[PDB]
Ligand binder design. Sequence first.
Ligand code: SF4
Ligand code: SF4
Lengths: 352, 55, 147, 110, 193, 76
Amino acid sequence: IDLQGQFISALQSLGLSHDLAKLLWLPLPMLMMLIVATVGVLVAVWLERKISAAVQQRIGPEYIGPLGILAPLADGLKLIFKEDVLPANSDRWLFTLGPAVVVIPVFLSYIIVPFGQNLLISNLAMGVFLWIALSSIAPIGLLMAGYASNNKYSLLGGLRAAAQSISYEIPLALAVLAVAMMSNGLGTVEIVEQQSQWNVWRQPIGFLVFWIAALAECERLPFDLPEAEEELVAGYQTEYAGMKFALFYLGAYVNLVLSALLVSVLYFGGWSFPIPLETINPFLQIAFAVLGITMTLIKAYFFVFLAILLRWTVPRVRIDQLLDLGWKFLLPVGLVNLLLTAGLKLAFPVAF
Amino acid sequence: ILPGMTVKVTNPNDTYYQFQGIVQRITDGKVAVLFEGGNWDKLVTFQASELEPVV
Amino acid sequence: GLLAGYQFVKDLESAGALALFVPPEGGFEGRYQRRLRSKGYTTLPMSAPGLGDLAAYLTQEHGIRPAHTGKEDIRVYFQPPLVTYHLENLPPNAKGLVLWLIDGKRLSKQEFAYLAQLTQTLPKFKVVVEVGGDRVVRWEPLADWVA
Amino acid sequence: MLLKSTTRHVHIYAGHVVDGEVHPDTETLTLNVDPDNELEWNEAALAKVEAKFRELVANAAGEDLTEYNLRRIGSDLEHFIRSLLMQGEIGYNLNSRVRNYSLGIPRVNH
Amino acid sequence: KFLNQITNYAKEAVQSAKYIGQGLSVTFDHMRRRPITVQYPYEKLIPSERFRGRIHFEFDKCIACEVCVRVCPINLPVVDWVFNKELKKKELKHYSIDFGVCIFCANCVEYCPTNCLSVTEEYELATYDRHELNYDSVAMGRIPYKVTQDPMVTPIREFAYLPAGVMSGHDLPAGAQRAGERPEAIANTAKSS
Amino acid sequence: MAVSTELLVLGVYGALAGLYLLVVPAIVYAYLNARWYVASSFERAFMYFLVTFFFPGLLLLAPFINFRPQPRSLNS
Ligand code: SF4
Ligand code: SF4
């Protein structure tokens, strides 16, 4: 229904300087994506907390609210209410700036996830490449948290956070190059409007590549070494007490949600009940919008579910067993996939 | 029922079913049965209706 | 409910002895204790499973005999009453001295009646008893709930 | 590195508090009587504790700097505090915090 | 020399994926099995016929034998007597146990001849202060709790009190009994053929 | 004569809101508390998705709900 048009025209009817009107529509989706991001964090926390109890014949929170619905609310409000402590020789500027640096770009990368056509913020012609770029800023914040702490116990485990995050960006890049072949570019709308009746069937290998490189962004118990609670307590996090630890926590879960939404838009699509949709008009547009949003969230939820379900199925790996995936299983296979897709697009340019 | 009087239990919905035990103390309708048996003497409060004043 | 004023304090000042039927989670009752402390009342919970005759520990002066372990042969301490000592150690602008009992189920009818009758005598003194139960925090005078 | 004796309401170190750090110097022997406010202190009894500490380090100490010895000093101070708290100079705080009678319950001295 | 290396490589990969999917299916199977959780405050668990919780005490049956102190590992119970002079009787003037020190070995219960001193199923002891655990003679009898007679509890039996073959104690008939016959029933059965 | 399409679209997505975060969440609560112990492994994930898609609502009217077990009758 082009809500931008009516918002600007109704607001341009009582004046308000039409350029200013186009300026004043900016913050609405820019904060709506923050709303759904925070909600996705709350949902991811509650989901992990209840499914990690289902796996174990356990029952998660039910005394917080009805079903633990208000558990991360309690967590966040507490961590606001907690004291913050700045240890003895730690720096004052870098300590309270590390978590901001590792948290910000994950939010900033929500300017590309569609949720529906013309239902996103500012489709960039670069798109996913900007995500691959902004994701490489996190190790700076992690090394900042390591250096800005007298805790050798922390820095010894903050360098290995800039060893895996600096290792699973190359195949993460190659698996999306393999999609940039097909889709005439890099914009998400172009990656997905190429699906009108999915890339997973034609990228059976790059799926594993992207999906192993996304889980291994210092997130999950298959690796999550920099928070290896048993190996060395909380790594770089153990001196962060109040809302700063909440920033780290938030950042992990919101990055997981972003990975799920991004696998959805890349390989499956944030539309397309798998029949060739649009074969069957504002009252119909508001229906297909809801349908596309719903199916997007279905696939994102399935990937969040599988991701949390590996956390309780897959014991961790030291650091050498880890880095012998990168450069020895993900990078050669990503190169092979790239060359394969290139050769097939050269021979069979149809279907790509 | 009164103190010092051995009793037994008549309640299939109780783990202490058909145990004989000596009453110890009575306050407010609930009576403390004392199960002299095994090694350690156990003490539990039963209602007067769960019991049966055996001889 | 999700928000409640100070009618609990009026009910307590009126009856003298209430009986809370809070849930077995212990998360939604201390706020009323706060509402009492927000007026001037001072609290002391002392966990009834551990109180004796309740005429020797509250009114009169009684003898506590600590734990000897082969060493330090039997000795008494004679701690003073719980209700004529904290009641005299109040601040100046003190409305009264409420009394909280966490586990009231373990006590009996007789001392419930005693605590109720003890509200009228010894004036600046009130009582509350957390007899666990209902899934919504409701209360009742403690002269009631018995006879 | 530090050599401390951390009981309750007596914490002894071996450095010099500059602003909140400690900086072990090997000769300053700070003290931190009752941080958690289990007791309500006056100006006199606290000075008596101070003087006990001074005439307990200097008057009887000429041996090594082990934690054994500082722990012994802390024990002597924590018994001196019993003495002050029984005789009736200082008393418990009564505040709406924990109120756990670590030292003793109140007697009447019959 | 080189092809065999790639085949062993792919074989290791496939075996790893298979052994991961195995645990995947296992954990996805555990999330239909009913929770064995015991939702305690509303779904409390019933103690056994020998659990050793709080000690009981009668004032009328004691005769001040001092066995309780002479047998406790740490000589804990505070018996206090005065020996009135009618003929010989030790008069018991006070009796306490500090349950912040007691170990619940119940040897006290074991060697009390008068059956005065017993164990109760109270495991819900806690205070904001440890000078309240020192229970007096009139605060040790005190008529224990009896979990089942609680309007807001769904009691559960434990593994020794469930019917034969049964393992959990959650969704049970209202007439279940332990495993087998009592010896009285066996005797009256053999007597009647 | 408010048959106009603009007003009716405003009304219908306002009603899609009021249906999204007043009504259906209670239905999720009912269907979930009904079968939490007796559920399958696929239906469990489906239920969790029903929670996810409507989660912004369950934050609002959860404080006004009590799943305490409604104390049993004791005499019989
Ligand atoms: S063992 Fe029994 S009779 Fe002897 S002192 Fe203890 S309670 Fe009394
Ligand atoms: S349970 Fe053990 S420690 Fe406690 S009174 Fe009995 S014998 Fe002594």
